[PDB]
Amino acid sequence: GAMANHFHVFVGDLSPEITTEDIKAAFAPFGRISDARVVKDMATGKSKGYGFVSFFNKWDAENAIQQMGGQWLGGRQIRTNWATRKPPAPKSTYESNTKQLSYDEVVNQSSPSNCTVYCGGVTSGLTEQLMRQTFSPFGQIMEIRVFPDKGYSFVRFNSHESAAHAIVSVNGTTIEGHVVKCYWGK
């Protein structure tokens, strides 16, 4: 049938009296077997204590593992464990380009020679000093160019790291009531 629904069970602790033929019969009522094999001695036909079974359907194998989970087959209880361990199919639980402010993502949004941050959203109180004092703890300032009338400013940093850091920190903050937005500028 479909290999996806075929399951291999690893059998162990087989009593020496047990043979390939025995597992076929023993496991058949619990699980439908396509084939079952005991690694047994060629001469005596006695089990070496282990083997494998191929079931036609997944439930059959699983049921058989449980029912034969140390069941008295032969003069002793045998062991079972699943060999073809069916993995569960995942889904996109993580990553699809998380939209947050990743410094790594932000720094790659511009060429490393660009040191300008575009600050927008500050329609009020927008002074050179206000931007300067805010941006300064994030990076070294070279220029502050402001336009309160248009509600934006250009913050010129000394370095690119400084500029990307400013964006990651300032983007989505609030300056005197106005929610600010920052990205790369010219």
Tokens at 182, concatenated: 């920052």
Tokens at 165, concatenated: 């850091």
Are 1-86 and 100-186 equal in CATH topology? yes
Q: Which amino acid is at 165?
A: H
- The CATH class that applies to domain 100-186 reads alpha beta
- The domain ranges of the chain are 1-86, 100-186
Spatial distance between the Cα atoms of 99 and 111, rounded to a whole number of angstroms: 20
Spatial distance between the Cα atoms of 82 and 76, rounded to a whole number of angstroms: 20
CATH topology of domain 1-86: Alpha-Beta Plaits (3.30.70)
Q: Which residues pair with 8 in a beta bridge?
A: 54
Let me know: does 163 contact 139? Beta carbons within 8 Å. yes
| Closest C-alpha to 67, from 40, 33, 38, 28 | 28
Kindly give, in sequence order, each residue whose CB lies less than 8 Å from that of residue 60, ignoring residues fewer than 6 positions away: 7, 30, 31, 32, 33
CA-to-CA separations, 40 to 3, 17, 135, in angstroms, rounded: 26, 10, 78
| Closest C-alpha to 106, from 123, 89, 118 | 118
| Closest C-alpha to 150, from 131, 178, 126 | 126
Overall size of the chain counted in residues = 186
